[PDB]
Amino acid sequence: EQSWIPKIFKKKTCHTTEKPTDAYGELDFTGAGRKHSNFLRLSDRTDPAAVYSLVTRTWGFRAPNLVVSVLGGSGGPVLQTWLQDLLRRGLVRAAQSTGAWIVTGGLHTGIGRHVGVAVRDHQMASTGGTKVVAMGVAPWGVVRNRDTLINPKGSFPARYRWRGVQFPLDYNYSAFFLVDDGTHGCLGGENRFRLRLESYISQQKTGVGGTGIDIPVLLLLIDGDEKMLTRIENATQAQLPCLLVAGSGGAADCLAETLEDTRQGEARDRIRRFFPKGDLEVLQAQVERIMTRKELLTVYSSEDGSEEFETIVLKALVKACGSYLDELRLAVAWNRVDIAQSELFRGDIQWRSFHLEASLMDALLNDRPEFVRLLISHGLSLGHFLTPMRLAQLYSAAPSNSLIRNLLDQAPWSDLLLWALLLNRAQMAMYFWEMGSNAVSSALGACLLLRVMARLEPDAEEAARRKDLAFKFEGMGVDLFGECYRSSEVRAARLLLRRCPLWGDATCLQLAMQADARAFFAQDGVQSLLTQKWWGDMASTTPIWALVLAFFCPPLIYTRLITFRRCLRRWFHFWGAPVTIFMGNVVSYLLFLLLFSRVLLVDFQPAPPGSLELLLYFWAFTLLCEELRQGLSGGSLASGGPGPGHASLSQRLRLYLADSWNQCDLVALTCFLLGVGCRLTPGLYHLGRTVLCIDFMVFTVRLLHIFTVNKQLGPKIVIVSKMMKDVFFFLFFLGVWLVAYGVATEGLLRPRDSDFPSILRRVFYRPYLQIFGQIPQEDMDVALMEHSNCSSEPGFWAHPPGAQAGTCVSQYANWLVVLLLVIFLLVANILLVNLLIAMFSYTFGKVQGNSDLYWKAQRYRLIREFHSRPALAPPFIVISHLRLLLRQALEHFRVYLSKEAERKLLTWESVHKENFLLARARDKRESDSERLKRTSQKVDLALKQLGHIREYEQRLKVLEREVQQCSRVLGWVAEAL
Amino acid sequence: ERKLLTWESVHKENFLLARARDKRESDSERLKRTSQKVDLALKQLGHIR
Amino acid sequence: EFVRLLISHGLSLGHFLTPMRLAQLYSAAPSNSLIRNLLDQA
């Protein structure tokens, strides 16, 4: 695998030399575990920046937040029980709450064996995730079995054997640094590597960018021995780390007594420690070098036990700093919320503004969404916070390298909302939308921007998040509009249609259209607005017959029947509505078909053409012109199309030829041109008629695409195209079963008059008309024909009475023909047709629910097409094109309001939004599964408070017994002596 | 091969732990642990009287 | 339910499983008709 490890890191032998390093790789214990632990042999006096870069970069460890270092020696008996409680409650629960490390002498049977027991017990007790990591620094020279690790290339698994002064390696850790100095069995022979590593960690920033704090580090000592004071004084003189001294040990309680003062030093150095030591420098150096400063040391409380440990750590680590680190930035660097809870809600110290204003910047970068609610709820106003230098700094952080970094390689709340939407943070984005201003338009725009940016990234793990976040925004927008349509439908109609300035001159509805949001058109209020849009200017659900009677006679609109200086505006309002230009288009098209039929049936003689064909040619030229206008005027940004504004001719040409109906009309026009050019040349008169009669069919079948808009045929026309998965199955099965019957029948009868078309006819075409109730039996039997022998081959022959069935049919074994007829009719008639009915029913009942939604989506585009179309008939399309080429959507697409009504309307909707979110939150709060959780927490609290009451009865009974004994003794000395 | 078996073993050890925690944090074992804790609290309250 | 406890915070199985032990474990046959009948041929 890697090979730079024996290139950089060195080792030493038996005043010594330097060589490349062997014996490295992963290590495996044949036990219950989820990973193989890493180890490395390395030489002393190496720059620890390399080994820190090794641990962070190559191996999969995350950069730490807190480095505690257990540093003591008990000598190896079993410890008393409350020390086990301390290491089992305080240095493991805190160490997996925050992502932390534990640096320990990594051998077995040392102080670290108890640490391993505590880690193992806490993993075996419960599973809360994020298993406790630990490194082990140990000297090469006391490990029991060598020669199963050392190999010059290296072993990636390594089986390890305990049985087969030395020590084994413990099996609880995840990293093994083996320092070497050159010896065999010198315990306690490497410390300066450990001190320089511990010191190098505390000058390195945390987080992604270098913004926040330096990593805190602390040395925790329970009882040691007579040389541990040197280890204390080296660190606390050199690098200023905060210390912590566990009370009631046996070699550090001397420091507790000499710090609790604020010669007796000889009284202390022989009472709370090993009395044979030699009072020569221990009283002077190994106490005075420690007690020359006291802002660093801290006595841990012996009367106050566990469940307060990180509070004591936090207080000591703040206190020793002032010999700028604060409390909130350290809390945000961890993930604990309750520390911020107590610090904010506690009324002992009034909080300033600079602390919050600085710490919010560190909260936004490392994606801690639960803290921003606290830091902005009872804190600062954001108008003080957001400054353009700060926002430039926030954009300046780029946490990834491929999404916004690649899109910048080419280069107040909504400003944060775009920032949250670019970098894929869900729990930030919901909060910034909920504290937003323009409610409904922002949701659909967010859905649009996610659907666009989902394409450019390569992976699928990103797309499975982007599509889900887009569905979440679309659903939230749908429910918000549904909770506003309930009251004052005029207000909702005014809200939906208007223009939102934050994204340019675009409306809400067009943004919903270009992102393909099905569920937003799915609901009913949008449908009821599109209905009134489609009835045009000033009509309301007048029936059809009034419209037809108005369109037939123009002096009936000035009267009572239509329902809504004066007349010349009334006449312009009536013909502007789309439901009238639709009727005009349909009437013109039917007149075109009737004229074409009267040309084809009676006329179209071999002659010079005349007026009744020149009218048709003029008509076809106008239809080609209108098709060219629709094509050139110009699709869907959700696919990745070129979008509005300007695009290429090579883009619009590719766009237009993908929708099938215009492709069919183009084919129809070219076939029409082929026929009408065929005719003008002489000598090919018949072929023009033959082509043009077939092309009439393709002109006629387009009369279904026009009626897609209407209400009662809309969801019915679309389903017919999705039922083409079964007609092909029917044709396959029937063709295979049909050809065999045809060949077998014409083999048994043997007609003695044969050609190619007669045989092809009598094999295919005659069985095909037998499944539709036409069964002629004249050519099948012989017992209906005349026994006539006119044939020359030997046998017996019969004469058919019909046509096309030859003139001679054999009679040998004629009953097989009748039996095959019965078999074929029973198969095709009784099984296949009924099976096809069953398949249509089962396909329809499934696909109906999707087809209805897809029809509801496209109705807006089909309405929008008709308004841009010219308002005159194809007999007046020359004058409409004259008005178009004389100077070379507005209705129900922009409503302009007064700004006081705008400012009122946004308040009206913001009230409903703030009501809606609170209603949903309280409905989640008062459910029937969170009652159980709060009762669980309250019963746990009650049990914990009940745990204090028990010992008071024991101590109070003991004290009352002592008072009774003292009263008995005083009464004895008074009245008994 | 040796890399691929590690790649799948990570997913297996993730999958079993996910299923066990999903069973652990359901809405029928909360009731059982609260029953046991109320019994423990009543037993410890029985000494005070 | 005990083997999880005795192998969780206990020994490594590379020490435990030895071929004499495994022969002893196969040597126990709790039934008389499924593996006993299929070792009647062996």
Swiss-Prot record, chain C:
Residues given in the record as ATP 2 binding sites: G10
Post-translational modification remark: Phosphorylation by PKC leads to increase the sensitivity to Ca(2+). Sumoylated. Desumoylated by SENP1.
Tissue/organ expression: Widely expressed with a high expression in intestine and prostate. In brain, it is both expressed in whole cerebral arteries and isolated vascular smooth muscle cells. Prominently expressed in Purkinje fibers. Expressed at higher levels in T-helper 2 (Th2) cells as compared to T-helper 1 (Th1) cells. Expressed in keratocytes.
Family: Belongs to the transient receptor (TC 1.A.4) family. LTrpC subfamily. TRPM4 sub-subfamily.
Described function: Calcium-activated selective cation channel that mediates membrane depolarization. While it is activated by increase in intracellular Ca(2+), it is impermeable to it. Mediates transport of monovalent cations (Na(+) > K(+) > Cs(+) > Li(+)), leading to depolarize the membrane. It thereby plays a central role in cadiomyocytes, neurons from entorhinal cortex, dorsal root and vomeronasal neurons, endocrine pancreas cells, kidney epithelial cells, cochlea hair cells etc.
UniProt remark on domains: TRPM4, is a temperature-sensitive ion channel, it adopts distinct conformations at different temperatures, markedly influencing where and how ligands interact with it. Decavanadate (a positive modulator), ATP (an inhibitor) and Ca(2+) bind to different locations of TRPM4 at physiological temperatures or at lower temperatures.
Assembly description: Homotetramer.
Disorder association: Progressive familial heart block 1B: A cardiac bundle branch disorder characterized by progressive alteration of cardiac conduction through the His-Purkinje system, with a pattern of a right bundle-branch block and/or left anterior hemiblock occurring individually or together. It leads to complete atrio-ventricular block causing syncope and sudden death.
Protein name: Transient receptor potential cation channel subfamily M member 4
Whole sequence portion shown: 439 to 480 of 1214
